[PDB]
Amino acid sequence: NASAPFNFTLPPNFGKRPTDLALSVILVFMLFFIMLSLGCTMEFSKIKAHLWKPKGLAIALVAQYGIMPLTAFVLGKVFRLKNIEALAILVCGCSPGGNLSNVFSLAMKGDMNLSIVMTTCSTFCALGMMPLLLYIYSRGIYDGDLKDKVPYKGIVISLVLVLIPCTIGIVLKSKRPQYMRYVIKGGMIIILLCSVAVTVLSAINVGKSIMFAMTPLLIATSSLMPFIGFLLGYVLSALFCLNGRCRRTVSMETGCANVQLCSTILNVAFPPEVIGPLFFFPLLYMIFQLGEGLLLIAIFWCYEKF
Amino acid sequence: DIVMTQSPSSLAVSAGEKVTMSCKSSQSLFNSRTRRNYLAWYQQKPGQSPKLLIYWASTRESGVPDRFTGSGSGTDFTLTISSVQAEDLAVYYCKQSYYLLTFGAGTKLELKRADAAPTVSIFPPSSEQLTSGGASVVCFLNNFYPKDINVKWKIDGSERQNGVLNSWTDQDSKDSTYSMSSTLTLTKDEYERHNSYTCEATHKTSTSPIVKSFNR
Amino acid sequence: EVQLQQSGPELVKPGASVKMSCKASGYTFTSYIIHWVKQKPGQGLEWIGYINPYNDGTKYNEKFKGKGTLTSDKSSSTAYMELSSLTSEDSAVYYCARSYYDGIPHYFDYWGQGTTLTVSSAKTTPPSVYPLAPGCGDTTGSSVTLGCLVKGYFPESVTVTWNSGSLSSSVHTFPALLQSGLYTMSSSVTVPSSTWPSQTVTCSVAHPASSTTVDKKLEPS
């Protein structure tokens, strides 16, 4: 069929819809409340002790950065994927641990301070040295340098939005821990309201429900990536002589990856008419692994009660 | 880097003789991840922009005649035309795009001729040319098909081969043969001290070179 | 379908400062990337570099990295190419080509008509036409050849015709190649010797770049 661009197109209003800005600000507010309420149940002693012992941090970074990009490249080469799809899956693989994974860590309820220090150190390491590995692993694809194409202001903004609410929570609990219940209830109700609002808004904001036109093997590998990541993290944690409570959160952090930076780099690198359904690939992909995480949650409820 | 070298670089086919242009490139320009075999075969008619014929070295562009076929793998590729028409005479470069965009040397297509019987002609500078302060002696050969031909000047038994200009025609469509011209230019005050100005042309159609002498 | 329009032929001094514009409005200009290819006379094609207008990215060849410069205009949907460094040998033909680009440029499916860039000292002057005639003791033969050489004409716009000669039959025109800053071209026409004295032949030179149309008739020696 030679080489032709996809018929999918984005309206010009997509650049500056007020609804897009509303969606961005409500997600920022949601994440701020998530992080505040999530750090409201954390203490400084455990995070200091885990910072003193970067053993789990070291193994987490080794699994996420020294192995995950390599296996992502291997799967991309094996699946005979196109240049755009291979670049997208490589960027997803080299992406650091997503914030939502910490939420899933709350479901794990094991060594939460280790989880937060691991994810912040992973984001710092990403900001420090992601472009070099991205350029090394993308030989023959996108011959451009791409070094300046990766976002930097977004990474530091995310780092601030992670550190500030957690630090505020630790300070408030250490000094004056007397208003836990009201803050928790308000956070929960506002979180539910914002979730309902975003669920209502995104359905009409996305549009063009042609996400099923994607080729089957790309969907298969997008589903396999979180599974293989979780399996590799669990195996590395178990074979390295780590206790069970301290390994589930590390495995879940390693398996989950952020997709916002991948979306931003995909949109800045390529026009939206050139990209077909892959523009909707990351937003669904994380959702997919969320469901996968839910399955793991069931497995947890198959072990804690039994 | 990758450089393309074409072995024949020149051939002539009348109506249906095989052509089979081949360029071996430098290394294996085959993508392992994507089974595409990056390569492009173009056509550039004289006085016209290049026209794409084959992409991926296996698939032809829509609208081109079916006579253009391209088959190859790894480093070995071949483009065949079979039934060559009068409009198929052009230059093919087999451009590659695996790593860097590099073009080949180019292969020229001509028309075969049975035999060539060139005719020589020599002319001294005009009378009014000398008054202008210069002089130029010219010699042109007509109706010779093969490209391999040499021309040289002997003056008083001495070979100089300096200050010579050569020009070739463009193989007009009237007949498969074409002509060639050669000129020698020199300023005033040294034209008449040697005279002679003998010309000699060597061509593959005759063992004995054709020599023409000039007097006065 | 879509067509690519070039700026047109360019004649510039060795002082550089030349720009070539290529326009293509038949599709979404940001969906494809534009390559520039340089061709020397009779020496084959040569690649320069490509530009992606969406991200305004430019890539150049190693030889053309120093001089090549690519810019894009989304509003005009045009591609501009600049060198800022020219020599007398730099005269060539530049083509703009459109290609798809996912991770690697695939192929140049559409090309422009080409822009002929020439660099020289200009200084156009009327040519001098000198006829050719045999008769220096030669026995001639069944047919005799004749021509009219031209000296000192700068521009390419010139033609030679034989209204009283053999016309388009048995006429050869050697293309001119640059030398010493002023190139020369030659013409040859054959005429039977028996009918040559009866009907004289005159060569007419047409120089549209100037206002000279001098005509003369050759005389045997």
What is the number of other CB atoms lying within 10 angstroms of the CB of residue A244?
Answer: 10
> Rounded to 5 degrees, what angle do the CA atoms A220, A222, A224 make?
70
Which residue do the tokens 């793998």 mark?
A: B73
**C-alpha torsion sign, points B26, B27, B28, B32:** negative
Quote the distance between the C-alpha of residue A84 and its chain's center: 20
Mapping DSSP onto H, E and C, the string for B21-74 reads ECECCCCCCCCCCCCCCCCEEEEECCCCCCEEEEECCCEECCCCCCCCEEEEEC
Contact between residue C132 and residue B126 where contact means Cβ atoms under 8 Å apart? yes
Contact between residue A167 and residue A173 where contact means Cβ atoms under 8 Å apart? no
Cβ <8 Å between A2 and B34? no
Q: What is the DSSP string of chain A?
A: ------S----GGGGS-HHHHHHHHHHHHHHHHHHHHHHTT--HHHHHHHHH-THHHHHHHIIIIIIHHHHHHHHHHHTT--HHHHHHHHHHHHS---HHHHHHHHHHTS-HHHHHHHHHHHHHHHHHHHHHHHHHHTTTS--S--TTTS-SHHHHHHHHHHHHHHHHHHHHHHH----HHHHHHHHHHHHHHHHHHHHHHHHHHH----GGGS-HHHHHHHHHHHHHHHHHHHHHHHHTT--HHHHHHHHHHHH----HHHHHHHHHHS-TTTS-GGGGHHHHHHHHHHHHHHHHHHHHHTTS--
What φ, ψ does residue A94 adopt, rounded to 5°?
Answer: -75, -10
Contact between residue B94 and residue B40 where contact means Cβ atoms under 8 Å apart? yes
Architecture in CATH of A12-305: Up-down Bundle (1.20)
Please give the structure tokens belonging to residue B173: 């469509």
- CATH code at C128-217: 2.60.40.10
Contact between residue B149 and residue B202 where contact means Cβ atoms under 8 Å apart? yes
If DSSP codes are grouped into helix, strand and coil, which group holds residue B116? coil
Contact between residue A119 and residue A162 where contact means Cβ atoms under 8 Å apart? yes
> Rounded to 5 degrees, what angle do the CA atoms A34, A30, A110 make?
20
**Shortest Cα–Cα distance, A268 to chain C (Å):** 7
- Print burial letters for C170-183: b (CB count within 10 Å at least 16), e (below 16): bbbbbebeeeeebb
Domain borders along chain C are 4-119, 128-217
- B60: which strand partners? B54
**C-alpha torsion sign, points A129, A133, A135, A138:** negative
Quote the distance between the C-alpha of residue C45 and its chain's center: 15
User: CA–CA distance from A51 to each of A143, B175, C35 (Å)?
Assistant: 39, 88, 53
Q: Which helix (H) or strand (E) holds B131?
A: helix B127-131
- B43: which strand partners? B51
> Rounded to 5 degrees, what angle do the CA atoms C208, C211, C216 make?
90
Q: Which residues contact B38 (CB under 8 A, 6 or more apart)?
A: B29, B30, B31, B56, B57, B96, B97, B98, C104, C106
Question: Count H helices, E strands: chain C?
Answer: 0, 19
Question: Subunits that touch chain A (at least 3 Cβ pairs < 8 angstroms)?
Answer: B, C
Q: Which residue from A2, A3, A80 is facing B33, i.e. has the nearest CB? A: A80
If DSSP codes are grouped into helix, strand and coil, which group holds residue B215? coil
Please give the structure tokens belonging to residue A91: 């960027």
* Residues A290, A258: Cα–Cα separation, whole Å: 12
Cβ <8 Å between A274 and C104? no
Mutation to test the A interface, candidates B31, B33, B54, B97, most A Cβ within 10 Å:
B33
User: CA–CA distance from C43 to each of C40, C62, C91, C196 (Å)?
Assistant: 5, 19, 12, 42
Please give the structure tokens belonging to residue A180: 């836990």
Please give the structure tokens belonging to residue A269: 């690198």
From which experimental method does this structure derive? cryo-EM
If DSSP codes are grouped into helix, strand and coil, which group holds residue B129? helix
**DSSP code of B127?**
H
What is the number of other CB atoms lying within 10 angstroms of the CB of residue A114?
Answer: 25
Q: What is the DSSP string of C26-75?
A: SS-GGGSEEEEEEE-TTS-EEEEEEEETTTTEEEE-TTTTTT-EEEEETT
Please give the structure tokens belonging to residue C25: 């409005």
Question: Subunits that touch chain B (at least 3 Cβ pairs < 8 angstroms)?
Answer: A, C
Please give the structure tokens belonging to residue A183: 């803050």
What φ, ψ does residue A189 adopt, rounded to 5°?
Answer: -70, -40
Contact between residue C218 and residue B127 where contact means Cβ atoms under 8 Å apart? no
* Residues A232, A71: Cα–Cα separation, whole Å: 10
Which value, in Å, is the radius of gyration of the alpha carbons in chain B? 23
Cβ <8 Å between A77 and B33? yes
* Residues C100, A28: Cα–Cα separation, whole Å: 37
Q: Which helix (H) or strand (E) holds B128?
A: helix B127-131
> Rounded to 5 degrees, what angle do the CA atoms A76, A79, A85 make?
50
Cβ <8 Å between B34 and A82? yes
* Residues B172, B182: Cα–Cα separation, whole Å: 19
Beta strands in C152-194 (DSSP E): 159-161, 171-177, 184-192
Which residue do the tokens 């990758």 mark?
A: B2
Which value, in Å, is the radius of gyration of the alpha carbons in chain C? 24
* Cα-based torsion angle of the residue sequence C125, C128, C129, C130 in order, rounded to the nearest 10 degrees: -160
**Shortest Cα–Cα distance, A86 to chain B (Å):** 9
Residues of C in contact with B123 (CB under 8 A): 132-134, 147
Please give the structure tokens belonging to residue C7: 């700026």
If DSSP codes are grouped into helix, strand and coil, which group holds residue C88? helix
* Residues A25, A30: Cα–Cα separation, whole Å: 8
Contact between residue A261 and residue A97 where contact means Cβ atoms under 8 Å apart? no
* Residues B27, B48: Cα–Cα separation, whole Å: 31
Contact between residue C60 and residue C48 where contact means Cβ atoms under 8 Å apart? yes
Domain borders along chain A are 12-305
Please give the structure tokens belonging to residue C8: 């047109």
If DSSP codes are grouped into helix, strand and coil, which group holds residue C23? strand
**DSSP code of C163?**
T
* Residues A125, A122: Cα–Cα separation, whole Å: 5
- Is C166 at the interface with chain B, CB within 8 A? no
Residues of B in contact with A77 (CB under 8 A): 32-33
Please give the structure tokens belonging to residue A203: 């359905």
The amino acid occupying position A122 is S
The amino acid occupying position C186 is S
Cβ <8 Å between C100 and A149? no
Class of domain C4-119: mainly beta
> Rounded to 5 degrees, what angle do the CA atoms B169, B173, B175 make?
85
**C-alpha torsion sign, points B14, B18, B24, B30:** positive
Helices (H), C44-201: none
Closest CA to C71 of C115, C20, C118: C20
Contact between residue C122 and residue C109 where contact means Cβ atoms under 8 Å apart? no
By DSSP bridging, strand B91-92 and strand B76-80 are unpaired
* Residues A35, B35: Cα–Cα separation, whole Å: 47
**DSSP code of B162?**
-
Contact between residue C52 and residue A143 where contact means Cβ atoms under 8 Å apart? no
B36, closest residue in chain C (CA to CA): C106
Closest CA to A208 of A8, A22, A23: A8
**Shortest Cα–Cα distance, B41 to chain A (Å):** 14
- CATH code at B119-212: 2.60.40.10
- C49: which strand partners? C36, C60
Closest CA to B116 of B139, B147, B89, B140: B147
**Helices A99-108, A112-137: inter-axial angle, 10-degree rounding:** 140
Q: Which residues contact A209 (CB under 8 A, 6 or more apart)?
A: none
What is the number of other CB atoms lying within 10 angstroms of the CB of residue A99?
Answer: 19
For residue B101, the number of C-alpha atoms closer than 13 Å in the C-beta half-sphere is 25
What φ, ψ does residue A110 adopt, rounded to 5°?
Answer: -135, 120
* Residues A124, A144: Cα–Cα separation, whole Å: 25
Which value, in Å, is the radius of gyration of the alpha carbons in chain A? 20
The amino acid occupying position B150 is N
Cβ <8 Å between A144 and C59? yes
Q: Which residues contact B20 (CB under 8 A, 6 or more apart)?
A: B78, B79, B80
What is the number of other CB atoms lying within 10 angstroms of the CB of residue A262?
Answer: 23
Residues of C in contact with A140 (CB under 8 A): 103-104
Mutation to test the A interface, candidates C77, C102, C107, most A Cβ within 10 Å:
C102
Please give the structure tokens belonging to residue A86: 């291979």
Q: Could you tell me the resolution of this structure in angstroms?
A: 3.4
User: CA–CA distance from C191 to each of B117, C2, C167 (Å)?
Assistant: 18, 49, 11
For residue C107, the number of C-alpha atoms closer than 13 Å in the C-beta half-sphere is 26
- Is C172 at the interface with chain B, CB within 8 A? yes
Contact between residue B40 and residue B92 where contact means Cβ atoms under 8 Å apart? no
Contact between residue B185 and residue B136 where contact means Cβ atoms under 8 Å apart? yes
Q: Which residue from A2, A3, A77 is facing B32, i.e. has the nearest CB? A: A77
- Is A5 at the interface with chain C, CB within 8 A? yes
